[PDB]
Amino acid sequence: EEGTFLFTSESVGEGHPDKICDQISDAVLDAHLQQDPDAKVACETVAKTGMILLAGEITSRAAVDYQKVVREAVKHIGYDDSSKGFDYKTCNVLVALEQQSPDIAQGVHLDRNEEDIGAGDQGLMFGYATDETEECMPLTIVLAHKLNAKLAELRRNGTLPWLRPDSKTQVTVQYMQDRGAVLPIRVHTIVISVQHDEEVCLDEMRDALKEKVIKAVVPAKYLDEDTIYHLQPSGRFVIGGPQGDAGLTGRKIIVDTYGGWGAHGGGAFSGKDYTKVDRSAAYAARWVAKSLVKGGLCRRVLVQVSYAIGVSHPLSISIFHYGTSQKSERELLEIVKKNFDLRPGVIVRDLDLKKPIYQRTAAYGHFGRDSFPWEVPKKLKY
Amino acid sequence: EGTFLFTSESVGEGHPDKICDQISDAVLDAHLQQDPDAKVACETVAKTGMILLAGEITSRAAVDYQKVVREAVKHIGYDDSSKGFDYKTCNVLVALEQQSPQGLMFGYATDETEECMPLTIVLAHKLNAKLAELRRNGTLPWLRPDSKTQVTVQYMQDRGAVLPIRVHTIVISVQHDEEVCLDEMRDALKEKVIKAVVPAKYLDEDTIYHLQPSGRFVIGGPQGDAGLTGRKIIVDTYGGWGAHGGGAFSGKDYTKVDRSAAYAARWVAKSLVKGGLCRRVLVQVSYAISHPLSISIFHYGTSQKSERELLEIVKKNFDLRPGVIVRDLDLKKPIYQRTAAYGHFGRDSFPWEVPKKLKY
Amino acid sequence: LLAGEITSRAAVDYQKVVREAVKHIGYDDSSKGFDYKTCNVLVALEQQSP
Amino acid sequence: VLVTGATGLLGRAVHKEFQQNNWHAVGCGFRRARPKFEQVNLLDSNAVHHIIHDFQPHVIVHCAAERRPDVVDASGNLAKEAAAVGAFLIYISSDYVFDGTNPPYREEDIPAPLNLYGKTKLDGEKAVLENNAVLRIPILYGEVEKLEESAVTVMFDKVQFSNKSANMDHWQQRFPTHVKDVATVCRQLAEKRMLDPSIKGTFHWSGNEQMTKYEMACAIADAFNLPSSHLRPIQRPRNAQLDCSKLETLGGQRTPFRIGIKESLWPFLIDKRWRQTVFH
Ligand SMILES: C[S@@+](CC[C@H](N)C(=O)[O-])C[C@H]1O[C@@H](n2cnc3c(N)ncnc32)[C@H](O)[C@@H]1O
Ligand SMILES: [Mg+2]
């Protein structure tokens, strides 16, 4: 056939244990930032039957009640009863937090000007952008997130009071290549599984999912009669979240970014402050990618940067425009060098990365969302 | 020129996340060796003096978790408190839930190395391996188990393929004792590690070296940084090249398609390149709720044959039904622990790394 | 949490023992402060078998 | 604001041009119309009927789609129901109606073509005109998704590959016209006719640049700073230039070829095409 290909991206709800951890981790980051903007935070989180474990390293002038913060986040997610498989009131919270290593502190940020502070680690990071949507994100991942977002919104609204927080959405789309750009044709398949109470019949849920969830989120243009709908496949899902499962911070890095598109350098966002370039440089790289697409230099773009620990400047910068620009890939690179300064000391100011609103990023993706600073394209001078 | 740079990283066996991956797969092994059909989702978490095992297990095996954990940590090299960690004295906590009795996946291959892997990650991997080797040698006795490497290669675009030209930048951070000085360490990493791993042709006087760039790496391992299973998925795979759907390998059994189909997808990708059918390729596999529903092959214009032609070639040489995959790759056998460090791809020892001769 | 040194031949399901004991005692819901169904069960028993 | 052949080079140009400048535009086409355009087959009578009788269109534009030979249709259906609602049809047509001998052929000149594509355009004009515009146009180029969408753009490969030489036709004089220039012309014949009737009868548009296949090839090469030395000059009209009088007499748009073809063909540069993969 034509240059057609399928592509799938998935998202999860706040109730998924990997994302519970991501959220908690960022809740502790927000708690610390509120009192100490320069709090060094690398907080991993572990969820299991009846348990939240905090582990990692934090150096902060802030004083934080980990119990309150952990338990309050589990409340905001909606696990408040044994019937749901988890209860913030009565779960086990364990804390294994130590100081950030001096050897890192000296080598990264001690006795140094803000602009000169070294990357908090070595690493590689990618930014991606695509004109297939207004948000400059893959349709597959945008729909995936929004679906979960609709579910929890409707859960909290009381319009669907039989919903529980754990949910997983998959979204497959039939794509056409277009001179390096990609074009979504139709939603091939939507899979939705979501946790629910014992009372509801299967057919009411599948009816609610389709009419009250999917049609509110997915444009009719993309849906048609051959669009496959697996709603609540294999029934069950009465219990969910941590109960009989195990989850961690940093195990949804693909869901958190580009749903399989672009590239990824391995690094996880949640629980980390700006000196950890896994997050700060990755947000920066997205800011670059989007700026180039919104600025009309290309239709699709992937950006790579890498860093060494204790070193301010990027070790490497790489631009691939997928042959969707009249300008050469080296021309774009040159434009990027004179409009952007990607040292973590400068990015923190440009993107304002000491604000305690990281918990907002811990679900429904870190990119393509309104009011995130990295989502606001910089005007380029060339 | 029309050249460009690309970076990939690797980590050593003593890196906390990779510790967690190795234990997770040592656990898996210990179960399979007793029970071929053991189901396993084993998460490992590591932090100062603690190994926590967590997850779901359905097996007929009774495993001495304490011997498994301590043996792995011994092997890795954490045998004294002066190194931040000791298998003899550490705390092993178990929260596993034993009982007794859909998805994209990507393969990638490139002819730019003999191992059919991007040169970037290949060199990064090998750099960490020379460190472990020289540590165990006692050639560099001041070495310790935790380390990280990073290689930036300067490439040329060549008709869809990528042509390595030189090594632009190398980073090595490795945990060390308190005796050795900085200059000696740096002199050793360049001369004994880098020059023994990187082919001479790729090293020139303009090659930048960030060696012990932190200045001090005495505190390390779980003490330096919390470790978790499944947090090095790009190091496990293609180092920013190709693509990735999102699933961790370590701690899962073969019935998890995230692992077994990912190994198959590589096997196919590496077969096509080594069959001379393409200079470089990315293989996609949509499995559906049976055979994989959709398969795309991106040969990057590096194949004289069409994508449909390469597909057919794939169909008559490969059974990609999970059941058949485990037979073909012998996935019931308990040696996953050797995968959990130095990347799952690019090493001849693995069934998925032995190219199937293609008849078409 | 279970801690201590055991030397024995038995293969005990510490899941069932801990959960069934807590059930018998009568802790079966979050409203009561504790629930055998949902509680964390941590095992750091150091066991051998001669 | 209904556009047919909206998936074609021309139709995508039309729909774009209306929608950006104060119209609620809705295009259609047979092959692969969704997601951007409500799908409709022309030869399906009830399908055509539904959308017109359901949309309430101010104006309609029937675009004759696809090119390349360079070697069927009942469009009357459209005019019946185009005029049924308060709106007028603009049947796009080709200079392949005149013989190509007495240029510039007038609006009111008499047509005399030959074989496939010749008179077969007139039958559509008969069917449109009887039962109540006919806007003729020359060979078209524009921003194509595939080189074969225009008889101008197909040549680009031959222009790039010096390693093997090719021969270009210097026989036939033509006026390569940017579909985008036609897109505006079409917006202008609608923006006014609703106010100033009774604008109908056969009409003529064309760009002002006279070229042959060979000259177009060399125009393209010199636009991209490429070698053209490998190009070789060597039942169709010799020169059927379209006397663009009526609509020019009123008061159109013209994009210089060397800029418009450069804007259109840069994504098919060898080097760019190599880079156009889904993954890096
Ligand atoms: C930079 S560290 C720590 C991450 C985070 N910044 C924190 O404070 O926990 C992440 C990895 O880098 C390596 N590392 C740890 N301490 C280091 C040091 N002092 N110098 C260089 N590299 C180090 C270890 O392999 C570790 O797993
Ligand atoms: Mg996670």
Numbering used by the authors:
A (entry chain B): 14 to 395
B (entry chain A): 15 to 115, 135 to 322, 325 to 395
C (entry chain C): 66 to 115
D (entry chain F): 20 to 90, 103 to 163, 167 to 268, 277 to 293, 295 to 323
Copy text verbatim from the article accompanying this structure deposition.
S-Adenosylmethionine (SAMe) is the principal methyl donor of the cell and is synthesized via an ATP-driven process by methionine adenosyltransferase (MAT) enzymes. In humans, there are three genes, mat1A, mat2A and mat2B, which encode MAT enzymes. mat2A and mat2B transcribe MATα2 and MATβ enzyme subunits, respectively, with catalytic and regulatory roles. The MATα2β complex is expressed in nearly all tissues and is thought to be essential in providing the necessary SAMe flux for methylation of DNA and various proteins including histones. Here we report the crystallographic and solution X-ray scattering structures as well as biophysical analysis of the MATα2β complexes, providing the basis for fresh insight into this widely utilized system in biology.
The crystallographic structure of the MAT(α2)4(βV2)2 complex reveals that MATβV2 interacts with MATα2 through the insertion of the C-terminal tail of the β subunit into a cavity created at the interface of the MATα2 dimer. The complex has four active sites located at the interface of the MATα2 dimers. The structures show that two of the four active sites are occupied by SAMe or adenosine whereas the other two are empty, thus providing details of structural differences that accompany SAMe formation by comparison of empty and occupied sites. In all of the structures the adenine group makes a π–π stacking interaction with F250 of MATα2, supporting the hypothesis that the substrate (ATP) and product (SAMe) can occupy the active site in similar orientations. In addition, the N-terminal loop (residues 1–13) of both MATβV2 in the complex, which is orientated to the same side of the open active sites, is disordered. This observation raises the question of whether the N-terminus of MATβ could regulate the gating loop of MATα2. In our case, co-crystallization and soaking experiments with an excess of NADP yielded crystals of the MAT(α2)4(βV2)2 complex without NADP. The structure of the MAT(α2)4(βV2)2 complex presented here has direct implications for a broad range of SAMe-based biochemistry.
